[PDB]
Amino acid sequence: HMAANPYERGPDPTESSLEASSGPFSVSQTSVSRLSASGFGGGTIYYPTTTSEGTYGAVAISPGYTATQSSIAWLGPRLASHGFVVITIDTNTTFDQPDSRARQLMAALNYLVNRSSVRSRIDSSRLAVMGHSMGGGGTLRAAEDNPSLKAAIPLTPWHTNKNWSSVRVPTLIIGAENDTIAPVSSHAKPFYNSLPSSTPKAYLELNGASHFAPNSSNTTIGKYSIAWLKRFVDNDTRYSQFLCPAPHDDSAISEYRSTCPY
């Protein structure tokens, strides 16, 4: 038999538990000021209250162009309530390009491990990155330049670079069908196609959604982000059951591609 996974947290998942507003863990918050944050413009840290089940993995989430922390803040308690330490960040300037946001994502993870007040609750060897729009472009660049990351979830990503053939981090790209700012035909889909065949990857296209779909509470985005982070940050195979959907059975999903090598 396969060895027991020590990174498993929370009870066995179901479809109703993943689509719920909150997970099985209570969440507390703490803030990081812009001036004390070295490399990024501060943010808020979301962490589970209880530690009796062991340490958790850390996730850094970046907003998009001319966007602040509040546009992605709903992912904070949504992801943390399932057993993750999440930091939503602000950028140094609201006009920072994707390559600049990639550096600020790793700087936020560096703060979580070395300087944050919740560093004792974090497993430093299991980190992930997320982002919306240009933050999603910075997510791809961070995963390419930091292969030690466990997962990466670009949300309607935007980037001038379409070549991501060196990304070794399991990447879940979530695109919007009617995206007019970062069209999937020139952004999300070329990003997914350029990812290596040996890298676990998936492309989720939201049916009839706009570019700002990730800026509000979304059941589809929340369920598959939890499943992806659980599957690769925690190696939790209990969440693999949620990663093989049929788009014709979900009105919120218009497309789904996925390749798993391991």
Catalytic residues: 133, 179, 211
- Sheet containing 27-32: give its strands across: 27-32, 43-48, 84-89, 56-62, 122-132, 151-155, 171-176, 201-206, 253-259
Tokens of 181: 């700012």
**Whose Cβ is closer to Na ion: residue 37's or residue 118's?**
37
32 binds Na ion (CB under 5 A): no
75 binds Na ion (CB under 5 A): no
Minimum CB separation of residue 121 from Na ion in Å reads 23
Minimum CB separation of residue 13 from Na ion in Å reads 22
37 binds Na ion (CB under 5 A): yes
- For every residue of 185-252, which 3-state class applies, written as one string? CCCHHHHHHHCCCCCCEEEEEECCCCCCHHHCCCHHHHHHHHHHHHHHHCCCHHHHHHCCCCHHHCCC
Residue 207: CB atoms within 10 A of its CB come to 15
Query: Contacting Na ion (CB under 5 A), which of 247, 255, 257, 259?
Result: 247
Region from 30-38, 113-121, 126-134, 172-180 binding Na ion, contact rule CB under 5 A: 30-38
Minimum CB separation of residue 107 from Na ion in Å reads 9
196 binds Na ion (CB under 5 A): no
Tokens of 148: 């030690």
The DSSP call for residue 3 is P
245 binds Na ion (CB under 5 A): no
Region from 60-68, 72-80, 108-116, 251-259 binding Na ion, contact rule CB under 5 A: 251-259
Minimum CB separation of residue 207 from Na ion in Å reads 5
CB 173 within 8 A of CB 187: no
Number of residues counted as binding Na ion (CB under 5 A): 4
Q: Applying CB under 5 A, which residues contact Na ion?
A: 34, 37, 247, 253
